[PDB]
Amino acid sequence: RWLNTTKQFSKTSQELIGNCIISSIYETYFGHLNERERADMLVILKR
Amino acid sequence: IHFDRNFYQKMKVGVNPRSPGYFIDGLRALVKLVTAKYQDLQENQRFVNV
């Protein structure tokens, strides 16, 4: 069970570096965007 | 860079008022987030090992 958690943890580690980008972008750019515009940005970033 | 260019296309800012301000600030904030996340991750792995 512990081993399964560790494998998930490694995946989580990889995922977190990628996610920090998204978080930093909302902080810097999203504050003045409308909700639909935030959605389109999120898409065009995600891609 | 690509996101910043796309953003200034979508925002409709046509000619020259597009300072690198958002670029610099988001870049600086990304150091803070990544460092904090890494420290938390190290601690959690250490805790699970313990």
UniProtKB/Swiss-Prot annotation, chain A:
The chain holds residues 3305 to 3351 of 4092 of the full protein. It is found in: Cytoplasm, Cytoskeleton. Belongs to the dynein heavy chain family. It comes from Saccharomyces cerevisiae (strain ATCC 204508 / S288c). Present with 195 molecules/cell in log phase SD medium. The gene is DYN1. This is Dynein heavy chain, cytoplasmic. Cytoplasmic dynein acts as a motor for the intracellular retrograde motility of vesicles and organelles along microtubules. Dynein has ATPase activity; the force-producing power stroke is thought to occur on release of ADP. Required to maintain uniform nuclear distribution in hyphae. May play an important role in the proper orientation of the mitotic spindle into the budding daughter cell yeast. Probably required for normal progression of the cell cycle. Dynein heavy chains probably consist of an N-terminal stem (which binds cargo and interacts with other dynein components), and the head or motor domain. The motor contains six tandemly-linked AAA domains in the head, which form a ring. A stalk-like structure (formed by two of the coiled coil domains) protrudes between AAA 4 and AAA 5 and terminates in a microtubule-binding site. A seventh domain may also contribute to this ring; it is not clear whether the N-terminus or the C-terminus forms this extra domain. The dynein complex consists of at least two heavy chains and a number of intermediate and light chains. Interacts with DYN3.
